[PDB]
């Protein structure tokens, strides 16, 4: 009375004989950082997502010591997920998200990229969305888009009392 599947994600198949690569699916890689990208366990009661969120295959290693792991389904919520929803609606492309594995955005280390940028440069993931800072060093190897929220090296102050 239980279902098992050989492949956790559904592979896409060539329909008949048509020379058209399925360009409308793009493995998008994200990074866990609230509130832009936040992680929720699948609702154990109904085994689904609430509609404002999106499915995402988070790869959890089996144990802190064991290197083995599974791409367990997980439910992705936030602001970047919503803007990705609107972007997918307007551009009309499907997608199969999966979270990062190295845990960081990515910084140059011995001429090697890591993290989100590392997984995007090697063309293992076409588009990358989340809380990513536009930077000069990153613009060299990766192509960015028009920013939607500003940022910088800002300062904050404790709110002083009235006088």
């Amino acid at each position, epitope marked *: 009375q239980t279902l098992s599947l050989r492949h956790a994600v559904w592979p896409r198949y060539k329909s008949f004989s048509d020379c058209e690569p399925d360009d409308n699916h793009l493995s998008i890689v994200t990074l866990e950082e609230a509130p832009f990208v936040i992680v929720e366990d699948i609702d154990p009661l109904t085994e689904t997502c609430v509609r404002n969120t999106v499915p995402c295959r988070k*790869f959890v290693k089996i144990n802190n010591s064991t290197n083995e792991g599974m791409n367990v389904k997980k439910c992705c919520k936030g602001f970047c997920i919503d803007i990705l929803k609107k972007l997918s609606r307007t551009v009309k492309f499907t997608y199969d998200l999966y979270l990062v*594995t190295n845990g960081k955005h990515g910084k140059k280390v011995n*001429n090697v990229w890591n993290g989100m940028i*590392g997984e995007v440069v*090697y*063309q293992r993931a076409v588009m990358a969305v989340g809380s990513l800072t536009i930077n000069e060093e990153r613009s060299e190897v990766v192509d960015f888009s028009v920013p939607f929220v500003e940022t910088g090296i800002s300062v904050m102050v404790s709110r002083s009392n009235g006088t």
Partner: antibody
Amino acid sequence: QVTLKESGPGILQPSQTLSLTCSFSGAAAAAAGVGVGWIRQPSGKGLEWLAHIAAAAAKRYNPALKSRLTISKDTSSSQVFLKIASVATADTATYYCTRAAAAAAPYWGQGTLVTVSA
Amino acid sequence: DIQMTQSPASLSVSVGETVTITCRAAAAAAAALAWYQQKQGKSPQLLVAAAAAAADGVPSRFSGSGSGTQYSLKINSLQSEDFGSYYCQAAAAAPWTFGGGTKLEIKR
């Protein structure tokens, strides 16, 4: 330890399918990173790219041969099945299954020869 | 797809001296290059990753230098285990293409 072993017939007629395979040990095919790829070495010649898969279950192919290449992984036995149908006589050379860590440089095995001709 | 034309196939040096070998590719933003050393009758193995990180078990004198398009390998003193071919690949584009190489032998 990290052992790579291949399996495939030493000869085959053209216009058929070859189902060679490789098993990798010393780690798992789903070991959070390092995967398995395949590389082709024509005899007395350079090399050409075939395919690779990582632990995260992502597969990439060679665009020139996006017609007949098929590949799958079995983490239970820690191995990789290959399926290459409609072979051509120009395939008379060796093959190399490789440990395919996330860097662009995979780590190679012993290699296996295939001879397809009349 | 990226073409990648290697160093001239006619390169060889006597045992125990310096040599430099570089393979030339497209001048786009491409530094994720991999360097291999090839054994006749055996499997080719790594020499340097990312054009600067030498692999494990690699002795010192295979210095991998260069940038841009010119990515060179420099040998202080050629020895017996250094004999073989030298291959190079670039990972910038979607198709990952290897190099041609060059055989090394005593120059007498």
